[PDB]
Every structure is written in structure tokens, then in C-alpha cells.
Amino acid sequence: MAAEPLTELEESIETVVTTFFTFARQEGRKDSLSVNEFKELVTQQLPHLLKDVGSLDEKMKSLDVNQDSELKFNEYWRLIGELAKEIRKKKDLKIRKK
Amino acid sequence: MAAEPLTELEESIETVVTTFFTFARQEGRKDSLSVNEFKELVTQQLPHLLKDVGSLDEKMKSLDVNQDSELKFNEYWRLIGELAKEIRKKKDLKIRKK
Ligand SMILES: [Ca+2]
Numbered sequence: 617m618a619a620e621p622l623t624e625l626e627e628s629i630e631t632v633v634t635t636f637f638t639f640a641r642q643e644g645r646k647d648s649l650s651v652n653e654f655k656e657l658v659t660q661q662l663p664h665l666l667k668d669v670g671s672l673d674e675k676m677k678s679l680d681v682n683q684d685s686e687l688k689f690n691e692y693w694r695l696i697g698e699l700a701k702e703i704r705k706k707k708d709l710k711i712r713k714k
Numbered sequence: 715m716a717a718e719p720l721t722e723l724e725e726s727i728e729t730v731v732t733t734f735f736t737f738a739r740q741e742g743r744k745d746s747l748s749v750n751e752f753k754e755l756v757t758q759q760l761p762h763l764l765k766d767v768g769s770l771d772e773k774m775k776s777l778d779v780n781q782d783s784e785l786k787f788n789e790y791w792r793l794i795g796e797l798a799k800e801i802r803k804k805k806d807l808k809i810r811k812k
């Protein structure tokens with residue numbers, strides 16, 4: 617359900633989970649990102665880093681892929697990954713694979 | 715002055731990225747964690763979260779889909795999901811939790 621006490625890495629994985637949760641509460645359902653929580657998060661929280669708040673919709677489609685449009689409790693998480701690499705990885709992903 | 719703060723999510727991806735990196739560099743290739751390199755994270759800094767510094771092999775196989783014995787940045791990054799999940803999830807089936 618949630619966290620009793622934490623070491624360093626445990627704190628720093630929490631801080632992003634609480635950010636997730638506090639936003640993700642908004643429309644429906646805290647446990648899933650909804651699309652006026654997600655776009656709010658990129659608009660508000662990410663904007664400098666995810667310098668494409670605009671075409672969130674593409675990232676959403678890429679994230680969701682069951683396409684239930686609940687950005688699920690690890691679909692969503694990927695995003696933090698993309699920012700995590702982005703700092704290192706300006707644009708240079710490409711990939712294409714079925 | 716300089717020493718300008720970044721957005722909350724920038725701060726938090728950096729703090730985990732730097733931690734990652736100081737392990738990523740331990741052995742060959744300052745991006746990939748090899749087996750020992752990987753085990754060092756859990757062994758050193760992750761006692762409560764994934765209380766299993768035994769079957770790190772299981773995690774490794776679950777993580778390194780290609781089984782190259784390098785968790786590249788993005789492969790390693792998987793763990794952070796399982797962490798960010800566990801802190802909420804942990805054993806939401808039996809325990810309980812806390
Ligand atoms: Ca929601």
C-alpha cells in the first residue's frame with residue numbers, strides 16, 4: 617500500500633512516486649495517470665526537461681500501449697525513464713521493432 | 715547565484731542518475747552495470763526495498779532481457795521501476811503494508 621521508512625535510494629524513488637500520486641489523484645483514480653493529470657505533469661512539472669509538453673499525446677500513445685488510456689502503474693513509470701536517459705540522451709533513440 | 719535549482723523531476727532523475735553512474739563506472743563501460751556492478755547497488759544501498767541480496771541472479775535475468783551481462787543505462791533503469799513500484803506495491807497480496 618505505502619512505505620514504512622527508507623534509505624537514500626528508497627527516499628529518492630519515493631519522492632517521484634509521491635509526485636506521481638499527488639498529480640494522478642486528479643481526475644479519476646490515484647493509482648493510474650489520466651489525461652488531465654499527465655498533460656498537467658508535463659506542462660507543470662517536466663517542461664524544461666520534457667521539451668515537448670505540446671505533443672504529449674505521442675508520448676501517451678507510446679506509453680499506454682494497451683491503449684486503455686489509463687497510464688498504468690508501470691506504463692507511466694517509463695516517462696521518468698525517458699527523462700532519466702534524456703539528461704544523457706539528447707534525442708538519439710530512434711528504434712523501430714514489432 | 716550560479717548553482718541554479720532545476721525542476722523537482724530534474725533534481726530527482728539527477729540524484730538517481732549520479733548514484734547509478736558511480737556504479738556504472740565501477741567496472742568496464744561507464745554506462746552498463748555488469749553482474750558484480752549491479753549486485754553492488756542492492757548489496758550496498760537497497761536493504762529494505764528488495765530484501766533479497768541473495769537471488770540477484772533472478773533480478774538480473776528479469777532485467778537484462780538480452781542476457782548480455784550488461785545492464786545498459788535503460789536496462790538498469792528497469793530496477794528503478796520495480797523499486798518505485800515496490801514502495802507502493804510491496805507485497806499487496808499478503809503484506810500489507812507498510
Ligand atoms: Ca488518475
Ligand SMILES: [Ca+2]
Pocket residue numbers: 679680681682683684685686687688691
Ligand atoms: Ca494503459
Ligand SMILES: [Ca+2]
Pocket residue numbers: 737738739740741742743744745746747748751
Ligand atoms: Ca560498468
Ligand SMILES: [Ca+2]
Pocket residue numbers: 778779780781782783784785786789
Ligand atoms: Ca543487456
